[model samples]
Target: PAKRYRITMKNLPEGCSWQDLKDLARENSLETTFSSVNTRDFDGTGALEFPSEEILVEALERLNNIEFRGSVITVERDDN
Candidate 1:
């Protein structure tokens, strides 16, 4: 129910690009509240933006601890 929930996905698959993450959100069909993605500044960490708890939770559940290209990624709230 919040305005935004920004989360971080770490240990992302090698060669993972910003568009890859964008496609991920779209793949889950949660792009409505999926505001944006930032994957450049960090080495293996990416930031994702989603508004509201429902959208955030849904995305997190579907995206967290998942295997992508044989790599397991961790997804959690980015408090900072």
Candidate 2:
């Protein structure tokens, strides 16, 4: 099964940057297949692909460790 989830982080902790997130993803063995960064507002959007749902959950859990004032995390399945 293939799934697509949207995760958003807002009001990131002091000194946190999009690069930090990218590094975390790389360190966790999750490839950043697509990414978009907004320097004007210090925001970013990214999409990560995984071979299985279990792997996605593992990666997302790790991502959750990053502290942020606000965040939106979702997990959804793709019907294909």
Candidate 3:
């Protein structure tokens, strides 16, 4: 089963869009190896789905502290 990770974007400046964040994430990842990635800014939340805990944890290791659009991005499991 895939696990959902919530993406948090901080310190966003003008003219920056969700697409930029997506682009930033892809650039920072070791590989685009996730099952899927998506986001909803309605409440400033986004998500990525991993096929298993291994891939998810690998991603967490690879992605932690990566900066996107001049802001640090964060990820956490969305169990809901």
Candidate 4:
């Protein structure tokens, strides 16, 4: 129950909370546990930690590179 994902969203607007992004993953049926190591470094950047990988795969395929809040988001498999 600890799958990791590095979601890279470019040009994210300011004042965006990590919970907001977490909700996006939850929308994709991901039982999410977001890790906010350093989400506010560049505009709005963060990672999501999933409880399952299978669901994560679906989320990535369905959500990756999709424009949200005026930015194109990308998801990558992160092992760190």
Best by lDDT: 1
Could you tell me how far off, in angstroms, the CA of residue 70 lies in candidate 2 after the best superposition?
Answer: 18
- The TM-score values for the models, in the order shown, are 0.68, 0.42, 0.49, 0.61
List runs of model 1 lying over 4 Å from the truth.
Answer: 12-15, 32-42
lDDT of 3 by residue, 1-80 (tens): 45434333333232334565457667765233332223334334345554456645654665565566465655544543
Candidate 3 ranges with C-alpha deviation above 4 Å: 1-18, 30-43
Estimate the lDDT of model 4.
0.57
Candidate 3 Cα lDDT to native: 0.47
> Which candidate do you rate higher for TM-score, 2 or 3?
3
What RMSD does model 4 have? Answer: 3.4
Report clash pairs, candidate 4. Answer: none
Evaluation by lDDT, superior candidate among 3 and 4: 4
> How would you order the candidates by TM-score, starting with the best?
1, 4, 3, 2
Each candidate structure's count of clashing pairs: 1, 0, 0, 0
* lDDT at position 31, candidate 2: 59
TM-score of 4: 0.61
Provide the RMSD of all predictions against the true structure, rounded to 1 decimal.
3.0, 5.9, 4.6, 3.4
**lDDT tens readout by residue for model 2, 1-80:** 46544444233323335675566567656554433344433444444444456645665565554543344322222221
Model 2's TM-score against the true structure: 0.42
The 10-residue segment of model 3 with minimum total lDDT is 7-16
Give the higher-TM-score candidate: 1 or 3: 1
